[PDB]
């Protein structure tokens, strides 16, 4: 099967087995410079050339067997970058391995990287760099077969200014002063478990660590360590549950890195070092499902991997499925159902926003000539989850379906698979239930746009109070507003508060007087919980409350998680009173934003 997002030679032609990366980080030039040594195994007879992905890389030379070889860069193909063809000096037989050492330098404009000035950090004294390779940005750091169909181990040595610390998606393997430059340090890393390259990660900054479990340090700038250690304290208990459900955690360490506010995603499951947004820091551990999610990826995604990005739902549906099982183990089955139902609500929202015929409301997609970053949404997460929850109920319940899950992980560990591999295995595992599986509308579930053909069964117990309060507000007239009071919230958890706001946002706009009264009685402006504040601010802006404009602009820019930043900017652009402010604010912040987020918000706003 073809990876339409990669220009490199496919796995049927050759396979990278190992990367040795030696590089130096230059904050003055905003470049990573060094060598990438790829141990490549031929999958063909008489192999005489191969192609790697690159994007905005400067190649100095390519060395094989101690000598330079011929290579050429093809024309750039937009978001895919430029293909790099390398002429092998000796034809390779099948299964023969060689080492190809490429000397390269990244561009400042690397879409994989954000370079922060001291001013953009917590500490204000030192600059900061972080990577984000998923889906296809690893090629903007180093030449590689940038496709999740290929898995490799890696070792790395990274030279940085001595006042800073480097971390990677790997086990830390020592530091020393840089023997060539006393103003620098060299940090070493080893990743002994084979991984797709999208899992390669690097951060360099003024980082400190705190131990929070037997195999977990939290890393961040000093200003955030204390809050992060508390917020994620349940990590080890989640890892133990995850091991029970998925089998052995094979990666050794499970560290967490809390990035600066411009980190563009809730989390990234980089092996040995999950990256998360500081917008998780609600002060009460209430957004810890994101940690449960990233933990779960150590099985579904990092062990069993999607073969191409068209099959991304395999990564996300199964991970959300495991995530909600971890939460259910910790807080009860009724809570698992509460979050499952909330996820269905997010899928409804996506389908409504995209449109019920939109190609990216399909579960299995076709990314031919589409930038994965433009396609990305919560659909593969929630439509994928819905399919699995539906199957769980069809096939005899969670205990039975968890047996399939563990078997599936065992079966495909260290491999990259397609939707058919998954469905073939489902049928084999549940062969005594084929008659039931054969009545599943597979083509609709997998390939039709819109809401899925069947909605699962959800327990309503923790949801009822959220809907009831939302409905009171929606059905209230002016002469009913007096009856609302802070006592309304006294028995709602933060999770239920968030769901009340989600329910209400689905019916937005509300009358302006309603939203004013809400603030007057509940003081939602004072809540720092990022998920709650996000929905609250969207509700205010869509209901045309001008007072909320500065609050929404501030949330949109003072952090950069796209889940929040993109919709806030879009709501602000849609509101006539804030439109010009939204565009100008974007234009003022554009140069200092994450490159991917800057591109997407700019497209969202039609700024060019
Ligand atoms: C979430 N991660 C931490 C950052 C974004 O990572 C991506 C993962 C997959 C991707 O490609 C798609 C998008 C939609 C449907 C199918 C495939 C695009 C981006
Ligand atoms: Yb041959
Ligand atoms: Yb400044
Ligand atoms: Yb098949
Ligand atoms: Yb009335
Ligand atoms: Zn995920």
The total of other beta-carbon atoms located within 10 Å of residue 488's CB is: 16
3-state secondary structure of 58: strand
Q: Which CA distances in Å does 553 have to 119, 234, 372, 580?
A: 20, 33, 27, 12
- Please calculate the CA angle 369-373-376 and round it to the nearest 5 degrees: 105
565 closest CA partner among 580, 585, 545, 547: 585
The total of other beta-carbon atoms located within 10 Å of residue 246's CB is: 25
510 — phi, psi (to 5°)?
-100, 165
Number of domains in the chain: 4
In a domain, 561, yes or no: yes
CA distance 307 to 302: 12
In a domain, 195, yes or no: yes
User: Is the same domain home to 191 and 82?
Assistant: yes
403 marked as binding residue = no
231 closest CA partner among 292, 276, 173, 287: 287
Structural domain ending residue among the three candidates 393, 425, 459 = 459
CA distance 204 to 26: 11
Rounded to an integer, what is the distance from CA 211 to the centroid of its chain? 24
Experimental determination technique: X-ray
Task: Report residue 90 as tokens.
Answer: 């000796």
Task: Measure 134 CA to ligand 1 centroid, in angstroms.
Answer: 7
Catalytic residue selected from 221, 231, 294, 323? 294
Task: Report residue 567 as tokens.
Answer: 């919709």
- Please calculate the CA angle 58-261-573 and round it to the nearest 5 degrees: 95
User: Is the same domain home to 30 and 142?
Assistant: yes
CA distance 296 to 320: 8
Give Dmax over CA atoms of the chain in angstroms: 85
Q: Are residues 196 and 146 in contact, defined by beta-carbon separation less than 8 angstroms?
A: no
Ligand lying closest to the C-alpha of residue 588: 3
User: Is the same domain home to 114 and 35?
Assistant: yes
> Residue 300 carries which DSSP code?
B
Residue identified by tokens 């409504």 is 352
CATH number at residue 286: 3.30.2010.30
CA distance 223 to 159: 25
CA distance 205 to 548: 35
User: Is the same domain home to 180 and 74?
Assistant: yes
In a domain, 7, yes or no: no
138 closest CA partner among 154, 121, 157: 154
CATH number at residue 392: 1.10.390.10
Q: Are residues 2 and 308 in contact, defined by beta-carbon separation less than 8 angstroms?
A: yes
User: Is the same domain home to 62 and 132?
Assistant: yes
3-state secondary structure of 104: strand
User: Is the same domain home to 444 and 467?
Assistant: no
In a domain, 3, yes or no: no
325, 329, 333, 337: CA torsion to nearest 10: -30
Q: Are residues 154 and 171 in contact, defined by beta-carbon separation less than 8 angstroms?
A: no
User: Is the same domain home to 80 and 194?
Assistant: yes
Q: Are residues 63 and 103 in contact, defined by beta-carbon separation less than 8 angstroms?
A: yes
Structural domain ending residue among the three candidates 183, 205, 227 = 205
For β-strands 255-258 and 273-276, DSSP reports them as: parallel
| HSE-up (13 A, CA, CB side) for residue 427 | 13
Q: Which CA distances in Å does 344 have to 264, 295, 351, 365, 521?
A: 24, 22, 11, 19, 30
Helix (H) or strand (E) run with residue 15 in it: strand 14-26
Q: Which residues hold their Cβ within 5 A of ligand 2, which is an ion? A: 45-46
For β-strands 128-131 and 273-276, DSSP reports them as: unpaired
User: Is the same domain home to 292 and 334?
Assistant: no
CA distance 36 to 54: 12
309 touches ligand 1 (CB under 6 Å): yes
Task: Report residue 77 as tokens.
Answer: 């193909």
> Residue 279 carries which DSSP code?
G
In terms of residue numbers, what domain contains 210? 206-302
Atom of ligand 1 nearest to the CA of 313: 16
Task: Report residue 285 as tokens.
Answer: 């551990």
Task: Report residue 397 as tokens.
Answer: 């319940």
Residue identified by tokens 């946002």 is 505
Q: Are residues 199 and 305 in contact, defined by beta-carbon separation less than 8 angstroms?
A: no
Helix (H) or strand (E) run with residue 121 in it: none
User: Is the same domain home to 308 and 388?
Assistant: yes
For β-strands 267-268 and 273-276, DSSP reports them as: antiparallel
Task: Report residue 51 as tokens.
Answer: 């192609």
40 — phi, psi (to 5°)?
-115, 135
Task: Report residue 543 as tokens.
Answer: 């209901």
376 touches ligand 1 (CB under 6 Å): yes
- Please calculate the CA angle 130-131-133 and round it to the nearest 5 degrees: 165
- Please calculate the CA angle 565-568-570 and round it to the nearest 5 degrees: 105
Q: Which CA distances in Å does 305 have to 132, 299, 409, 504?
A: 17, 9, 10, 37
CA distance 336 to 562: 25
Residue nearest to atom 5 of ligand 1 (CA): 134
Q: What is the 3-state secondary structure (H, E, C) of 403-414?
A: HHHHHHHHHHCC
Task: Report residue 325 as tokens.
Answer: 């099982």
Residue nearest to atom 3 of ligand 1 (CA): 268
Task: Report residue 108 as tokens.
Answer: 């400042």
Task: Report residue 470 as tokens.
Answer: 């939302």
374 closest CA partner among 583, 97, 136, 164: 136
The total of other beta-carbon atoms located within 10 Å of residue 520's CB is: 11
For β-strands 255-258 and 165-168, DSSP reports them as: unpaired
In a domain, 96, yes or no: yes
Structural domain ending residue among the three candidates 145, 170, 205 = 205
User: Is the same domain home to 367 and 423?
Assistant: yes
User: Is the same domain home to 200 and 212?
Assistant: no
Q: Are residues 168 and 202 in contact, defined by beta-carbon separation less than 8 angstroms?
A: yes
Q: Which CA distances in Å does 320 have to 301, 387, 397?
A: 11, 11, 17
The verdict on whether omega for the bond into residue 135 sits within 30 degrees of 0, i.e. cis, is: yes
User: Is the same domain home to 217 and 170?
Assistant: no
CA distance 263 to 243: 28
Facing residues of 62 across strands?
102
Q: What are the start-end ranges of the E strands in 123-239?
A: 128-131, 152-161, 165-168, 171-178, 181-195, 202-205, 208-213, 216-220
In a domain, 4, yes or no: no
CB contact set of 316 (below 8 Å; sequence gap of 6+): 301, 380, 381, 384, 385
373 touches ligand 1 (CB under 6 Å): yes
Please provide the DSSP assignment of 365-381 as one string: ---TT--HHHH-SSHHH
- 381 in active site: yes
Please provide the DSSP assignment of 416-468 as one string: EE-HHHHHHHHHHHTGGGHHHHTTS-HHHHHH--SS-SSPPP---TTTHHHHH
CATH number at residue 33: 2.60.40.1730
In a domain, 232, yes or no: yes
Positive or negative: CA dihedral 382, 383, 384, 388: positive
Give the end-to-end CA distance of the chain in Å, rounded to a whole number.
37
Say what angle helices 562-574 and 579-589 make with each other, to 10 degrees. 140
Residue identified by tokens 């995530």 is 323
- Residue positions counted in the chain: 608
Which value in Å is the resolution of this experimental model?
1.9
Q: Are residues 312 and 364 in contact, defined by beta-carbon separation less than 8 angstroms?
A: no
Q: Are residues 46 and 35 in contact, defined by beta-carbon separation less than 8 angstroms?
A: no
CA distance 295 to 254: 8
In a domain, 199, yes or no: yes
Residue identified by tokens 């003055």 is 28
Facing residues of 15 across strands?
41
CATH number at residue 582: 1.25.40.320
CA distance 36 to 21: 5
Task: Measure 513 CA to ligand 5 centroid, in angstroms.
Answer: 15
């Amino acid at each position: 099967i073809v990876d339409t997002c990669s220009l490199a030679s496919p796995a049927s032609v050759c396979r990278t087995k190992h990367l040795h990366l030696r590089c130096s980080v230059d904050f003055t030039r905003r470049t990573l410079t060094g060598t990438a040594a790829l141990t490549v195994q031929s999958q063909e007879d008489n192999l005489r050339s191969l192609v790697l992905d690159t994007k905005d890389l400067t190649i100095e030379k390519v060395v094989i067997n101690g000598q330079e070889v011929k290579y050429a860069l093809g024309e750039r193909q937009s978001y895919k970058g430029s293909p790099m063809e390398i002429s092998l000096p000796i034809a390779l037989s099948k299964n023969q391995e060689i080492v190809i050492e490429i000397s390269f330098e990244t561009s400042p404009k690397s879409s994989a990287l954000q370079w922060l000035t001291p001013e953009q950090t917590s500490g204000k004294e030192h600059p900061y760099l972080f990577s984000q390779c998923q889906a296809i940005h690893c090629r903007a750091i180093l030449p590689c077969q940038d496709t999740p169909s290929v898995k490799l181990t890696y070792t790395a040595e990274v030279s940085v200014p001595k006042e800073l610390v480097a971390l990677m998606s790997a086990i830390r393997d020592g530091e020393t002063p840089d023997p060539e430059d006393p103003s620098r340090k060299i940090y070493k890393f080893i990743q002994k478990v084979p991984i797709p390259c999208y899992l390669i990660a690097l951060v360099v900054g003024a980082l400190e660590s705190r131990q929070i479990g037997p195999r977990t340090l939290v890393w961040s700038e000093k200003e955030q360590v204390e809050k992060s250690a508390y917020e994620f304290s349940e990590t080890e208990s989640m890892l133990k549950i995850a091991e029970d459900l998925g089998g052995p955690y094979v990666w050794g360490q499970y560290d967490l890195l809390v990035l600066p506010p411009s980190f563009p995603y809730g989390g990234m499951e980089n092996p040995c070092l999950t990256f998360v947004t500081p917008t998780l820091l609600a002060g009460d551990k209430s957004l810890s499902n994101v940690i449960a999610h990233e933990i779960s990826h150590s099985w579904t995604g990092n062990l069993v991997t999607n073969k191409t990005w068209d099959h991304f739902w395999l990564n996300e549906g199964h991970t959300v499925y495991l995530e909600r099982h971890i939460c259910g183990r910790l807080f009860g089955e009724k809570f698992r159902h509460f979050n499952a139902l909330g996820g269905w609500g997010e899928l409804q929202n996506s389908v409504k926003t995209f449109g019920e015929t939109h190609p990216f409301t399909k579960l299995v997609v076709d990314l031919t000539d589409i930038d994965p970053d433009v396609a990305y949404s919560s659909v593969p997460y929630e439509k994928g989850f819905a399919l699995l929850f539906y199957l769980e109920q069809l096939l005899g319940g969670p205990e039975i379906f968890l047996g399939f899950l563990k078997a599936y992980v065992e079966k495909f560990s260290y491999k990259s698979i397609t939707t058919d591999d998954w469905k073939d295995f489902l049928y084999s595992y549940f062969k005594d239930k084929v008659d039931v599986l054969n009545q599943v509308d597979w083509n609709a579930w997998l390939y039709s746009p819109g809401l899925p053909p069947i909605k699962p069964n959800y327990d309503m117990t923790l949801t009822n109070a959220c809907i009831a309060l939302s409905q009171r507000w929606i059905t209230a007239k002016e002469d009913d507003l007096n009856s609302f009071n802070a006592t309304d919230l006294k028995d709602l958890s933060s999770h239920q508060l968030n769901e009340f706001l989600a329910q209400t946002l689905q019916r937005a706009p509300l009358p302006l007087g309603h939203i004013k009264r809400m603030q007057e009685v509940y003081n939602f402006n004072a809540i720092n919980n990022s998920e709650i504040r996000f929905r609250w601010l969207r509700l205010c802006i869509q209901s045309k409350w001008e007072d909320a404009i500065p609050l929404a602009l501030k949330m949109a820019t003072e952090q950069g998680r796209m889940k929040f930043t993109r919709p806030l900017f879009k709501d602000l652009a849609a509101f006539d009173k804030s439109h010009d402010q939204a565009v100008r604010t974007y234009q003022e912040h554009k140069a200092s934003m994450h490159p991917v987020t800057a591109m997407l918000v700019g497209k969202d706003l039609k700024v060019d």
